[PDB]
Amino acid sequence: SVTVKRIIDNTVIVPKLPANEDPVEYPADYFRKSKEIPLYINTTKSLSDLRGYVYQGLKSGNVSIIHVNSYLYGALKDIRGKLDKDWSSFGINIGKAGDTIGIFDLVSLKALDGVLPDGVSDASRTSADDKWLPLYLLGLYRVGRTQMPEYRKKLMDGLTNQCKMINEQFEPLVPEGRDIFDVWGNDSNYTKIVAAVDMFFHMFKKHECASFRYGTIVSRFKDCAALATFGHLCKITGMSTEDVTTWILNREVADEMVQMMLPGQEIDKADSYMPYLIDFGLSSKSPYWSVKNPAFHFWGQLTALLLRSTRARNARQPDDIEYTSLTTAGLLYAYAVGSSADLAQQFCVGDNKYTPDDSTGGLTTNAPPQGRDVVEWLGWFEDQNRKPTPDMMQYAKRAVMSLQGLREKTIGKYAKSEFDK
Amino acid sequence: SVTVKRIIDNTVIVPKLPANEDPVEYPADYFRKSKEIPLYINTTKSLSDLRGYVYQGLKSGNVSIIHVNSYLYGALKDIRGKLDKDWSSFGINIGKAGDTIGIFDLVSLKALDGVLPDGVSDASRTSADDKWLPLYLLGLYRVGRTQMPEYRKKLMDGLTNQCKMINEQFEPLVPEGRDIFDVWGNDSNYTKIVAAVDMFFHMFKKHECASFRYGTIVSRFKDCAALATFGHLCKITGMSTEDVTTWILNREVADEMVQMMLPGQEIDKADSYMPYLIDFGLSSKSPYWSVKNPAFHFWGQLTALLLRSTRARNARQPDDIEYTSLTTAGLLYAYAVGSSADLAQQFCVGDNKYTPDDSTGGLTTNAPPQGRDVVEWLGWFEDQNRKPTPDMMQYAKRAVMSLQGLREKTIGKYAKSEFDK
Amino acid sequence: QPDDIEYTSLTTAGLLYAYAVGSSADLAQQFCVGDNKYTPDDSTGGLTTNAPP
Numbered sequence: 001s002v003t004v005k006r007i008i009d010n011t012v013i014v015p016k017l018p019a020n021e022d023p024v025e026y027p028a029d030y031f032r033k034s035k036e037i038p039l040y041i042n043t044t045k046s047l048s049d050l051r052g053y054v055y056q057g058l059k060s061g062n063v064s065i066i067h068v069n070s071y072l073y074g075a076l077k078d079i080r081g082k083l084d085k086d087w088s089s090f091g092i093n094i095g096k097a098g099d100t101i102g103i104f105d106l107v108s109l110k111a112l113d114g115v116l117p118d119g120v121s122d123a124s125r126t127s128a129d130d131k132w133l134p135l136y137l138l139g140l141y142r143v144g145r146t147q148m149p150e151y152r153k154k155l156m157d158g159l160t161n162q163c164k165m166i167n168e169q170f171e172p173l174v175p176e177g178r179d180i181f182d183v184w185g186n187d188s189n190y191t192k193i194v195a196a197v198d199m200f201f202h203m204f205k206k207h208e209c210a211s212f213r214y215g216t217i218v219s220r221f222k223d224c225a226a227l228a229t230f231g232h233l234c235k236i237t238g239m240s241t242e243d244v245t246t247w248i249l250n251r252e253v254a255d256e257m258v259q260m261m262l263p264g265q266e267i268d269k270a271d272s273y274m275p276y277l278i279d280f281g282l283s284s285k286s287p288y289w290s291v292k293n294p295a296f297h298f299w300g301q302l303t304a305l306l307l308r309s310t311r312a313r314n315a316r317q318p319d320d321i322e323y324t325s326l327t328t329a330g331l332l333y334a335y336a337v338g339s340s341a342d343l344a345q346q347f348c349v350g351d352n353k354y355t356p357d358d359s360t361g362g363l364t365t366n367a368p369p370q371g372r373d374v375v376e377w378l379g380w381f382e383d384q385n386r387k388p389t390p391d392m393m394q395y396a397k398r399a400v401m402s403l404q405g406l407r408e409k410t411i412g413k414y415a416k417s418e419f420d421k
Numbered sequence: 422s423v424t425v426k427r428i429i430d431n432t433v434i435v436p437k438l439p440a441n442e443d444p445v446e447y448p449a450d451y452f453r454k455s456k457e458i459p460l461y462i463n464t465t466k467s468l469s470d471l472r473g474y475v476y477q478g479l480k481s482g483n484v485s486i487i488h489v490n491s492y493l494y495g496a497l498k499d500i501r502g503k504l505d506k507d508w509s510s511f512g513i514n515i516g517k518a519g520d521t522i523g524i525f526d527l528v529s530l531k532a533l534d535g536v537l538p539d540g541v542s543d544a545s546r547t548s549a550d551d552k553w554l555p556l557y558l559l560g561l562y563r564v565g566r567t568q569m570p571e572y573r574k575k576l577m578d579g580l581t582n583q584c585k586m587i588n589e590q591f592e593p594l595v596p597e598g599r600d601i602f603d604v605w606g607n608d609s610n611y612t613k614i615v616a617a618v619d620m621f622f623h624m625f626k627k628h629e630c631a632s633f634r635y636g637t638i639v640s641r642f643k644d645c646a647a648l649a650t651f652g653h654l655c656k657i658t659g660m661s662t663e664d665v666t667t668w669i670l671n672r673e674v675a676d677e678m679v680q681m682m683l684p685g686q687e688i689d690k691a692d693s694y695m696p697y698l699i700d701f702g703l704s705s706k707s708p709y710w711s712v713k714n715p716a717f718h719f720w721g722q723l724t725a726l727l728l729r730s731t732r733a734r735n736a737r738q739p740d741d742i743e744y745t746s747l748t749t750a751g752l753l754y755a756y757a758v759g760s761s762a763d764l765a766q767q768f769c770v771g772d773n774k775y776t777p778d779d780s781t782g783g784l785t786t787n788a789p790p791q792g793r794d795v796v797e798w799l800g801w802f803e804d805q806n807r808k809p810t811p812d813m814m815q816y817a818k819r820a821v822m823s824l825q826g827l828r829e830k831t832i833g834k835y836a837k838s839e840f841d842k
Numbered sequence: 843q844p845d846d847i848e849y850t851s852l853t854t855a856g857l858l859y860a861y862a863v864g865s866s867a868d869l870a871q872q873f874c875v876g877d878n879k880y881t882p883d884d885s886t887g888g889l890t891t892n893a894p895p
Contacts, residue, residue: 001661001663001875002663003875004663004666004667004873004874004875005873005874006675006679006872006873007871007872007873007874007878008872013666013678013679013682013873014682014684015662015663015665015666015682016662016682016688016689017648017651017652017655017662017688017689018642018645018648018649018652018688018689018696019689021691179584179589182581182584183584183585186584186585242770245768246766246767246768246769246770248767248768249763249764249765249766249767250763250764250765250767251763251765251767252659253767254767254768257767257768317731319730319731319732320653320656320657321656321657322656322657322658322659322763323657323728323729323730324728324729324758324759324762325659325758325762325763325764328762328764329762329763329764332764373772374766374774375766375769375772375773375774378764378766378774378776379774381764382776385783386761386762386764386791387760409731414729417823418729421819421822663875666873667871667873667874667875669872669873670869670870670871670872671869671872672870672872674872675872675873678873745863745864745867746863746867746868746869749867749869750867750869753869794877795871795879796871796877796878796879799869799871799879799881800879802869803881803883806887806888806893807865807866807867807868807869808865808888
């Protein structure tokens with residue numbers, strides 16, 4: 001399986017690929033080399049002075065991100081919370097049981113020389129800072145990282161959360177307004193504050209200032225789509241993680257699952273730095289990136305869609321994967337779940353249904369297994385000469401037909417194109 | 422089969438064809454003649470004067486390409502990184518382990534011309550220099566290499582990178598101001614700087630100025646589609662590079678496969694000169710060019726399309742090849758992969774699916790083989806009188822019948838015209 | 843399309859030839875890994891009679 005030759009000549013030929021190896025970065029590796037998350041923010045100035053730069057800056061659509069970050073650090077500086085138990089993530093002792101700390105558990109550093117942005121300021125601005133303005137700024141990050149006209153849907157979210165505080169005020173321009181949010185995400189330090197806010201209030205959910213977390217929720221598990229897909233697949237099939245894993249039927253998907261489930265990364269932990277590995281700067285290429293798990297993304301979503309999911313309808317269709325093989329496996333899994341409903345009873349009145357009697361091949365040797373055991377189904381499928389039965393094709397036909405208005409380059413579109421013949 | 426006579430006259434006719442000698446040039450051959458790459462930056466005017474020439478030149482009608490190249494040299498002159506290991510390529514030592522090296526560690530010379538085109542300048546420009554302007558100038562290579570109204574996306578996202586420091590700025594004219602950089606890709610010095618940038622930052626992926634690649638990326642593997650086509654065919658089928666090679670069933674494809682696999686061309690190397698063999702001017706006719714491998718291009722893409730690829734849809738259809746024979750070969754390969762899904766158990770909990778030692782191939786007289794073994798399928802195919810079966814023709818039909826919006830002279834349009842009449 | 847030629851006779855010839863290469867792909871193995879397919883076992887068509895070469 002190494003030496004190839006052309007038959008007519010009998011000469012060795014070595015098959016070669018351009019080969020691009022770009023590896024993932026686990027969160028634990030960051031803290032192997034550094035014990036702090038640096039936040040570069042130009043201090044100086046004053047809360048009242050920075051409030052004027054921002055308030056006026058937003059109204060004109062030219063405010064500096066440096067000013068925004070400086071204001072955000074000032075207004076959120078005094079917010080504190082008391083810990084019931086010790087708080088530790090990747091060896092960092094954030095706090096003990098008893099004592100208090102603020103939102104900035106990470107170590108802050110001070111930015112460069114004189115500020116290039118010179119002016120645009122409101123002199124007489126009231127101390128209504130902490131209340132509503134930081135909510136607004138952090139809320140623009142969420143409105144920022146959408147591209148479809150769902151803007152107005154999520155931009156009203158912000159306004160509604162600000163209305164719970166004071167008078168109704170919309171600040172940016174209509175067409176040009178969108179442009180001054182897109183860069184904000186691309187700022188490393190704005191991005192960190194967002195993640196720090198989200199993490200802090202995830203610990204303190206019952207805190208009064210928990211409303212800040214509305215624009216910043218979209219930071220938790222950013223680029224960790226692979227972990228959500230695994231979760232959704234458990235819920236839609238109703239099988240535990242263990243069982244779902246035994247139903248992986250392709251090598252590429254198995255590789256991706258072991259990459260996903262590397263131990264010591266605090267994935268199932270309640271309050272970890274992990275969910276913000278991209279925003280905190282712990283990773284540049286996430287192991288839970290959906291593009292870094294192409295086969296599992298396709299297999300997971302395609303199976304879930306055939307089991308009547310709505311999330312999978314619009315999921316991206318990856319390139320450079322085994323379309324044909326991954327579908328067959330995905331279809332077989334979906335057919336096994338959808339056929340085998342197995343509905344035991346849960347409540348009774350002295351009158352029970354004894355069930356573990358009579359379970360064999362109902363339609364002679366043609367009948368499918370009664371349950372969801374992958375070994376049973378592999379046996380049955382290999383009896384079917386390893387090609388989908390006219391019943392299985394009809395099952396998927398029904399799962400995709402009567403699906404309406406599908407996007408280009410999509411799981412849904414693929415699925416309907418493939419099965420709705 | 423050498424001599425040809427006409428039966429009526431017994432005379433000899435000698436069939437002749439016009440010579441067709443346009444031989445491919447390999448990256449290894451260049452460094453056997455010369456041990457350097459000549460880059461001609463004209464004068465050393467001054468960074469300040471040059472910055473003024475291009476800022477205005479861009480903003481108005483046109484700027485001189487000389488002025489761009491001169492400025493681009495000056496703007497990228499001081500950028501450097503430090504390497505962990507030795508960086509060598511085709512017998513050239515760029516730097517031993519631990520050196521600090523610049524972008525132009527690739528031999529600079531001076532152009533013999535008198536700088537006459539010098540007109541139109543903005544003396545006011547200062548700090549807004551290396552930060553973004555070289556990126557803008559580099560970007561226009563990527564934007565200019567498209568003729569389809571897709572450059573709207575490419576210019577739009579080109580601006581996003583500039584916004585990641587100031588001050589939104591769109592500089593050239595919208596309609597006529599597109600052709601001014603459509604010529605840049607034909608200046609052998611400009612394309613060399615582009616390749617120099619991309620090769621430098623492909624090594625130093627962690628540099629601050631790594632964003633300068635959002636433009637120069639289309640230089641890497643330019644006219645090396647034949648290598649990508651092969652890799653894409655591996656990833657879509659799920660077969661190894663060796664196994665794909667064994668599924669070549671045409672002679673013309675083999676010659677092309679032999680062509681692109683020559684022992685010492687640094688194909689599978691991390692950071693080489695090879696990918697930039699056109700833009701560095703190492704070759705005037707690449708061996709990995711789509712056009713120079715017409716049969717493999719056709720066969721390879723067609724097989725992918727039938728295996729549900731979306732990239733293959735719009736791939737160009739070459740002239741002057743065995744269409745009928747290549748298509749049967751491609752149909753057979755695609756069919757064998759689709760009918761025989763990989764499907765094996767990956768994880769277990771004590772309960773294993775045993776399967777080995779199964780002899781009978783489905784049916785007594787004529788039945789499709791269980792694996793992906795070429796010889797097993799060739800023997801099976803001769804038993805069908807070498808004429809594609811109804812199920813095979815149906816397999817090809819289903820995969821092409823749902824394709825919408827197919828462009829002229831593409832392989833996708835061809836496929837649907839043959840398998841979905 | 844030229845005129846003053848024999849359309850009918852040239853057509854048959856053109857189709858016979860195109861049919862001969864279309865229905866006969868002549869696929870053959872090119873590369874191997876210690877496992878070779880030999881084509882020439884027994885040369886006879888599909889149907890006992892009138893099965894094309």
